[PDB]
Design a protein around this ligand. Structure first.
Ligand SMILES: [Zn+2]
Ligand SMILES: [Zn+2]
Ligand SMILES: [Zn+2]
Lengths: 66, 47, 105, 28, 49, 115, 60, 99, 50, 59, 59, 59, 258
C-alpha cells in the first residue's frame, strides 16, 4: 500500500526511494539502471522497489471531504 | 452536557443527535452517518 | 432496534445495574451514553459493543464481542433501515502478525 | 503482408483488445 | 546432454515403432492375439511399445 | 495471544539465576553450567575457548529447546583441574582477547581516517 | 490489423472491427467438431511432411 | 443560500441533473440542464486535477511511459530474435510432430 | 485404464485429425516436467490427473 | 520475468545463462553459512525469490 | 471494585509505559488488558498508576 | 453506475475495478451461478442397458 | 591454554560501511561478533506513540509501526541513556527517552507527503536521519486529513525488535577458496570466484589443506544510518565483552556460594 520503510530481509531503508525511483524512470533510466543509481545492490532490496505496488494513490481518491 | 455528535456521510458536517431523534444531517439530508473518534487515551507500541 | 410488541420495545441505551435486570458481568462504561462504543476503543472478548435494552423493568439485550476476538473499534455508523428503525454497524479491526501455526502457500 | 515469428507480440495485442472490449464478467 | 540425446533417440524409435504397428493394422496384417479382438491386440502392442 | 513477550529472551525473571553449576555423576570431574537467558552467542565462544585448554577433556553446549532461553555447557577436565576453573579461565582470556581486538580496531580506524 | 490495433485508444479501433472485418470468429463446441485447428500459426501452418495442410482455424 | 456543488454533492447532482434533463420533453429545460451539467463537469474536473496536480500526476506519467517502453522493449526484443537466427541447438525444449 | 478417449468425433482434440492412433494424439506425454508440456499434453495430463 | 505457459522462448538453460552473468551459480545454488556456528554448510543451498501468499487460516 | 474499569499505566518492571484498562483487580494484583497487544496480563497493583480519561469545561 | 467514468465511481465511494455482475439483496452481494442442463430441441439416442430397452431417442 | 591475538585491517571505511579483516581468531569468536552486530548493539528507536488525531487512510497501528522503523541518529546519546525499564522515574524522562512530535494537516489542494522531516525532536542530537537524499515517507494525506501524535524514543537492541537493529547487512566470509573443504562442490568450476579469492583464473578451488583452521574472516558491516559503521563495531566488541564480564561475576558468586 505504501512503500515499506525497510527491506524485509536486509534492514536497509528503502522508504525514501520510491519517489526518487519513480522520478528516474520518468526521466529515461531503464528500470535496472534506476535501481543501482539509487544504491540498491542486493537483490533482496531490489525487489522491494520493483515489486512494490502503490495502492495509497488509489485510496487517496476517496476523499472524505472535498 | 455532551450531545453525542455524529459526522455526516455525504456532508462531513458534525451534527448533534440526542436520543429520540431522526438520524438525518442538519443539511443536505443524509441518512448514513458515522461517529467521531474517542477521547480516551490511544497509545501504541511502535512495534 | 425495533417495536417487539405493545409492551416490548428495544432501544440503544447504556444499561445500568439499577433498572436493566438481565445484565452481564461486563464493563458497560466502555460504551458511551448513546449506547454505542466509539471508534478507537480497545475491546476484548465479551465486552459490550452495542448496549441495548428491551422493556418488560428493562431486560438487557445488548450485543457483545465474540469471545476471544480482541480488536480496536474501527468505525461506527448509524442509520435507518427500510422500516425506519435505527440500525448500526460497528466494525472492529485486529492486527495479525504472522505467528507460528499460520498457513502460508 | 503477413506476420511471422514477430507473433508473440501480436498474439497479445488481439488478446488485450478483446479484454478491453469485453470485461471478464460480460457473460453476466 | 548426452542423456538428453539418449532419451530423444529412445523416444523417436518408440514413436517410430508405433507407426509400423499402425501400418500393419491399416493394411490388415496385425493378426489378433488368440483371446483378444483386433482393437485390443493393437492397443496392447502400442501400450507395450 | 499465546505469544511470549519479546523481552523474555534476555530479561531475567524474579528468582531465576543467571548461572547454575551441577556436579555430574557419571564421570569424574565433570560439571554442567546452566546459563539462563542466553543463546548461541555466548555459548559458542565459551565452548570453542575451552577446547583450546589442553587440560579439558570434554566441552560442549546445547540449547535444549529454542523456544526456551537456556543453554547447558558440559565441561570435563583432568583430575588436577576442576571445571569451575576451566570455565573461569575460558572467560578471562576470552575477555582479554576481545579487549585487545577492540584496541586494535580502534587504532586501525584512526589510522585509516586520514593516514 | 496489428498496427491499427496498436493505435487503438488513440482513435477508436477495437475488437469489434476484427470481428466485423472477418478475421476472428466465434466458434463453439458443437461446431468445433468440424474445425481443423492449428495451435500456433506459423509453426503449424508451415511446410514439412504433411500433417494436414487443411487447417481452418488457428488459436490465438 | 448554500450552493449545491459544495462540496460532495457534485456527482449526485450530476446524475440528478441528467435525470432532470431526461424527464423533460421541453427543449428549454434540456438545454439549461445541458449547460449547467457541462459547467459542473468542468468545475469538478478542474478541482480533481488540482488535487491530483501533485504526486499522482507524477505516477500517471511514469505508468503511461512504462507500458510505452514495454511496447518498445517488446518490438526491439523481437528484432533481436529475428536477428539471432543463426543456429538454435540447445536441448531443454520439445514439441509435437504428428504423422 | 485406456489411452485418452475419442471425445470429439473420432479424435481427442480438434487439433488432431480423424483417426489418429499415434502416441502424441492419444495422450503420450513425451516431455518432462523440466522441459514443460506442450499445450495438448497439458490438457491430457490434466484429464489424467483428474 | 515472464512465465506464460506454453512459450518456447523460455527454458532453463536460457535462464541459467542469464543468472550466471550476474555472478551467481547458474543453477541458483549458493553457499550459506550456519547462523549459529558460522561454519559453511557443506551443501550449497538453493535460494531465490518466490512469491508467497498468506492464507486466511490463521491459528 | 474500586479501580476495575479504569485506565491505568504500567509504571515499573518490564511493561513500563504501557496503557490498558483494568479488567479484574484484587487486593494484590490486577488484570490489565493492554491496548496495543492483544493480551491481558496480570500485573501487580503497585506497578500501576491511574491515568483517567475525562473532559473539562462541560459547557 | 453505468457508462460512468472513473472519477465518478470514486465519488460515489466505489471502486472502478469492481466487475459488476452481482445483485444487492438486503445489502448482500449475491451472484447467480450458471447452471448447465441438456440442450433442448435435440434428439439423443442413448442406450440404457439396465432396463427392458435397447435404445432410447430422447428429445 | 590461552587467548589468541587477533589483528585487524580496515580495507575500506566510508560513512556507510566498513570492510575489515580479522586474522588469527577462532571461527566461533568471529561469528559471535557477527551476531552481536545484528542483535546486541543499542540504538534509539521510537517505541511509544500516542495518537491524538489520525484521519489518514492508514490505520492507527500502521502509522505507529512505520514510525518505529524510522532510524534515528543515536551516536553519543545512546550510551548515556538508560533502558526504559531501569529508569527510576514514572512516565518517561529526558534521561531515558527522547520525545518526538508530529503535527500535520493537509490544507492545500495537492497531497501531503508526511515525511520524516515532520518529526520534531526535543533533543537536537537524536533526529531522524535527515542531517546531510529524500526522507522516509510516513503517509500521504489528502485535503482535510490529518495526523497529530507524540512519540517517544528509547534505547534497545535488535534482539527485542528488529527496529533496533543498526545494520543493513553484515557480510561475513572466511576461506574464499575451498581450502578447508568446508563446502564441497559437485562441479567446482561452475562456481564464481569470491571477491577475495587469491586464486588465478585457471584453477577452481584451492588444493585441500588438511591441517588448518579458519582465520582471516572478512567482514563488511553496513549501517542503516543510525550508528556510524565503525561505531557498530566498537560497540559490538564492548557489548560482547560486557556480556562476558557479567557472566563471570555471576559465576564467581555461584562458585563461592557452593
Ligand atoms: Zn535488503
Ligand atoms: Zn439529512
Ligand atoms: Zn526516565
Amino acid at each position: 500500500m505504501i512503500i515499506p520503510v525497510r527491506c524485509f530481509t536486509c534492514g536497509k531503508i528503502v522508504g525514501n526511494k520510491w519517489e526518487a525511483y519513480l522520478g528516474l524512470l520518468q526521466a529515461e533510466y531503464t528500470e535496472g539502471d534506476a535501481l543501482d543509481a539509487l544504491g540498491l545492490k542486493r537483490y533482496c532490496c531490489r525487489r522491494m522497489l520493483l515489486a512494490h505496488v502503490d495502492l495509497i494513490e488509489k485510496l487517496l481518491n476517496y476523499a472524505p471531504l472535498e | 452536557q455532551q450531545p453525542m455528535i455524529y459526522i455526516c456521510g455525504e456532508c462531513h458536517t458534525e451534527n448533534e443527535i440526542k436520543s429520540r431523534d431522526p438520524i438525518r444531517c442538519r443539511e443536505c439530508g443524509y441518512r448514513i452517518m458515522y461517529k467521531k473518534r474517542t477521547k480516551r487515551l490511544v497509545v501504541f507500541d511502535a512495534r | 432496534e425495533s417495536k417487539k410488541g405493545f409492551d416490548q420495545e428495544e432501544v440503544f441505551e447504556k444499561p445500568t445495574r439499577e433498572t436493566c435486570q438481565g445484565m452481564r458481568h461486563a464493563i458497560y462504561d466502555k460504551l458511551d451514553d448513546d449506547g454505542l462504543i466509539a471508534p478507537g476503543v480497545r475491546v476484548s472478548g465479551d465486552d459490550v459493543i452495542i448496549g441495548k435494552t428491551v422493556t418488560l423493568t428493562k431486560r438487557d439485550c445488548s450485543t457483545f464481542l465474540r469471545t476471544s476476538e480482541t480488536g480496536i473499534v474501527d468505525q461506527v455508523m448509524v442509520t435507518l433501515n427500510q422500516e425506519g428503525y435505527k440500525f448500526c454497524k460497528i466494525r472492529v479491526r485486529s492486527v495479525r502478525i504472522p505467528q507460528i501455526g499460520d498457513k502460508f502457500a | 503482408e503477413i506476420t511471422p515469428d514477430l507473433w508473440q507480440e501480436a498474439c497479445w495485442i488481439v488478446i488485450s483488445s478483446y479484454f478491453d472490449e469485453k470485461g471478464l464478467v460480460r457473460q453476466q | 546432454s548426452k542423456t538428453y540425446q539418449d532419451i530423444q533417440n529412445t523416444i523417436k524409435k518408440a514413436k517410430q515403432d508405433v507407426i509400423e504397428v499402425i501400418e500393419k493394422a491399416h493394411n490388415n496384417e496385425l493378426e489378433p492375439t488368440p483371446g483378444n479382438t483386433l482393437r485390443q491386440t493393437f492397443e496392447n502392442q502400442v501400450n507395450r511399445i | 495471544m499465546n505469544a511470549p513477550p519479546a523481552f523474555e529472551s534476555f530479561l531475567l525473571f524474579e528468582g531465576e539465576k543467571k548461572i547454575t553449576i551441577n556436579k555430574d555423576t557419571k564421570v569424574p570431574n565433570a560439571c554442567l553450567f546452566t546459563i539462563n537467558k542466553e543463546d548461541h552467542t555466548l555459548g559458542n565462544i565459551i565452548k570453542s575457548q575451552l577446547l583450546k585448554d589442553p587440560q579439558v577433556l570434554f566441552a560442549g553446549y546445547k540449547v535444549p529447546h529454542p523456544l526456551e532461553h537456556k543453554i547447558i555447557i558440559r565441561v570435563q577436565t583432568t583430575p588436577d583441574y576442576s571445571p569451575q576453573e576451566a570455565f573461569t579461565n575460558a572467560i578471562t582470556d576470552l575477555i582479554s582477547e576481545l579487549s585487545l581486538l577492540e584496541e586494535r580496531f580502534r587504532v586501525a580506524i584512526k589510522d585509516k581516517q586520514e593516514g | 490489423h496489428i498496427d491499427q490495433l496498436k493505435e487503438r485508444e488513440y482513435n477508436n479501433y477495437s475488437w469489434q472491427d476484427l470481428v466485423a472485418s472477418g478475421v476472428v470468429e466465434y466458434i463453439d463446441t458443437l461446431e468445433e467438431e468440424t474445425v481443423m485447428l492449428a495451435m500456433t500459426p506459423d509453426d503449424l501452418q508451415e511446410k514439412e511432411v504433411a500433417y494436414c495442410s487443411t487447417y481452418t482455424h488457428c488459436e490465438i | 443560500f448554500r450552493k449545491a456543488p459544495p462540496n460532495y454533492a457534485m456527482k449526485k447532482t450530476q446524475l440528478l441533473k441528467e435525470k432532470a434533463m431526461a424527464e423533460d420533453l421541453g427543449d428549454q429545460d434540456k438545454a439549461k440542464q445541458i449547460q449547467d451539467q457541462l459547467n459542473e463537469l468542468e468545475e469538478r474536473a478542474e478541482a480533481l486535477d488540482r488535487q491530483r496536480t501533485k504526486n499522482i500526476s507524477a505516477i500517471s506519467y511514469i505508468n503511461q511511459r512504462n507500458r510505452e517502453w514495454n511496447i518498445v522493449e517488446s518490438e526491439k526484443a523481437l528484432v533481436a530474435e529475428s536477428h539471432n537466427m543463426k543456429n538454435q541447438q540447445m536441448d531443454p525444449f520439445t514439441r509435437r510432430q504428428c504423422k | 485404464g485406456k489411452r485418452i478417449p475419442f471425445g470429439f468425433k473420432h479424435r481427442t482434440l480438434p487439433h488432431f485429425i480423424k483417426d489418429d492412433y499415434g502416441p502424441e494424439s492419444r495422450g503420450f506425454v513425451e516431455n518432462s516436467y523440466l522441459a514443460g508440456l506442450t499445450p495438448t499434453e497439458f490438457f491430457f495430463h490434466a484429464m489424467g490427473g483428474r | 520475468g515472464d512465465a506464460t505457459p506454453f512459450n518456447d522462448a523460455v527454458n532453463v538453460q536460457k535462464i541459467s545463462n542469464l543468472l550466471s552473468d550476474y555472478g551467481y551459480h547458474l543453477r541458483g545454488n549458493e553457499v550459506l553459512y550456519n547462523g549459529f556456528t558460522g561454519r559453511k554448510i557443506t551443501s550449497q543451498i538453493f535460494i531465490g525469490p518466490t512469491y508467497y501468499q498468506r492464507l486466511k487460516h490463521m491459528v | 471494585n474500586e479501580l476495575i474499569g479504569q485506565t491505568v499505566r504500567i509504571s515499573q518492571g518490564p511493561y513500563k509505559g504501557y496503557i490498558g484498562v483494568v479488567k479484574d483487580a484484587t487486593e494484590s494484583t490486577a488484570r490489565v488488558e493492554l491496548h496495543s497487544t492483544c493480551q491481558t496480563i496480570s500485573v501487580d497493583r503497585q506497578r500501576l498508576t491511574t491515568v483517567g480519561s475525562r473532559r473539562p469545561g462541560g459547557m | 453506475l453505468n457508462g460512468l467514468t472513473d472519477r465518478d465511481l470514486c465519488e460515489l465511494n466505489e471502486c472502478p475495478l469492481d466487475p459488476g455482475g452481482y445483485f444487492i439483496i438486503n445489502g448482500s452481494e449475491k451472484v447467480l451461478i450458471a447452471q448447465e442442463k441438456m440442450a433442448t430441441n435435440t434428439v439423443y439416442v442413448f442406450a440404457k442397458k439396465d432396463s427392458k430397452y435397447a435404445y432410447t431417442g430422447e428429445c | 591454554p590461552y587467548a589468541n591475538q587477533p589483528t585487524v585491517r580496515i580495507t575500506e571505511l566510508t560513512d556507510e560501511n566498513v570492510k575489515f579483516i580479522i586474522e588469527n581468531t577462532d571461527l566461533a569468536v568471529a561469528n559471535s561478533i557477527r551476531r552481536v552486530f545484528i542483535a546486541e548493539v543499542p540504538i534509539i528507536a521510537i517505541d511509544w506513540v500516542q495518537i491524538d488525531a489520525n484521519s489518514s487512510v492508514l490505520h492507527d497501528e500502521f502509522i505507529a509501526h512505520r514510525l518505529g522503523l524510522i532510524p534515528l541518529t543515536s551516536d553519543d546519546i545512546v550510551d548515556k541513556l538508560q533502558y526504559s525499564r531501569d529508569c527510576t522515574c514514572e512516565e518517561f524522562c529526558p534521561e531515558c527517552s527522547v520525545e518526538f512530535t508530529l503535527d500535520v494537516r493537509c490544507n492545500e489542494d495537492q497531497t501531503r507527503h508526511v515525511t520524516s522531516r515532520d518529526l520534531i525532536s526535543n533533543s537536537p542530537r537524536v533526529i531522524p536521519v535527515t542531517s546531510r537524499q529524500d526522507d522516509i515517507l510516513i503517509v500521504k494525506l489528502r485535503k482535510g486529513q490529518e495526523l497529530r501524535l507524540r512519540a517517544y524514543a528509547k534505547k534497545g537492541f535488535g534482539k527485542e525488535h528488529a527496529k533496533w537493529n543498526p545494520t543493513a547487512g553484515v557480510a561475513f566470509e572466511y576461506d574464499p577458496d575451498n581450502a578447508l573443504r568446508h563446502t564441497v562442490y559437485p562441479k567446482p568450476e561452475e562456481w564464481p570466484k569470491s571477491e577475495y579469492s587469491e586464486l588465478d583464473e585457471d584453477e577452481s578451488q584451492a588444493p585441500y589443506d588438511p591441517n588448518g583452521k579458519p582465520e582471516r574472516f572478512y567482514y563488511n558491516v553496513e549501517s542503516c544510518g543510525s550508528l556510524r559503521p565503525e561505531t557498530i563495531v566498537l560497540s559490538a566488541l564492548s557489548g560482547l565483552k560486557k556480556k562476558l564480564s557479567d557472566l563471570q561475576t555471576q559465576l564467581s558468586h555461584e562458585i563461592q556460594s557452593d
